[PDB]
Each structure stands twice: as C-alpha cells, then as structure tokens.
Amino acid sequence: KAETVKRSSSKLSYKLQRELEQLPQLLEDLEAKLEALQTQVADASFFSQPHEQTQKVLADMAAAEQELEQAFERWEYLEALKNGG
C-alpha cells in the first residue's frame, strides 16, 4: 500500500525511448508500404492475378494503412507522454 508510482517516473521509459525512436522509421515504412501496395492495386491489371495473389496484396495493403495510422497515434501518444507524464 502506498508504494504506487504517482507519475513520478512515467513520462517515458527506455522501452518507450526505443519505441518512439524506431516508430518514425516505421511510419514512413508503412506509408511507403501503403504507397507501394496502393500503386499495385491502382492498376486494373492487378486484379487480373489469381485471388491468392491479389488478396495477398489487398490484405497487406489494408494492413499497411491500419498499421500506419495506429502506429502514428501511438507515436503522437508517446510524443505527448514524453511531454506530459
């Protein structure tokens, strides 16, 4: 009892240090990833491939954008946390 962390050391942890420092690279990764996938799916010749090829790219495409935005608000969370914790 009363050994809690009352936001004494919570503004960042090392695990967030390496989280926040790699995450930007990951953002542009996933953005370029989405970019790279959306341009495949952009062409009508894309859906000329078998379902197992196309859905591979389609699913990976949708995963890229979702990963990106979620990682982005994770990033801004870590940024905000680093400023106020």
Domains by residue range for the chain, with CATH: 1-85 (1.10.287.380)
Instruction: Show Cβ contacts of residue 19 under 8 Å, excluding neighbours closer than 6 positions.
Output: 74, 78
Q: What are phi and psi of 16, to 5 degrees?
A: -85, -30
Q: Which residue has the tokens 């196309």?
A: 54
Q: How was this structure determined?
A: NMR
AA letter at 9? S
Nearest to 13 by CA among 25, 21, 4: 21
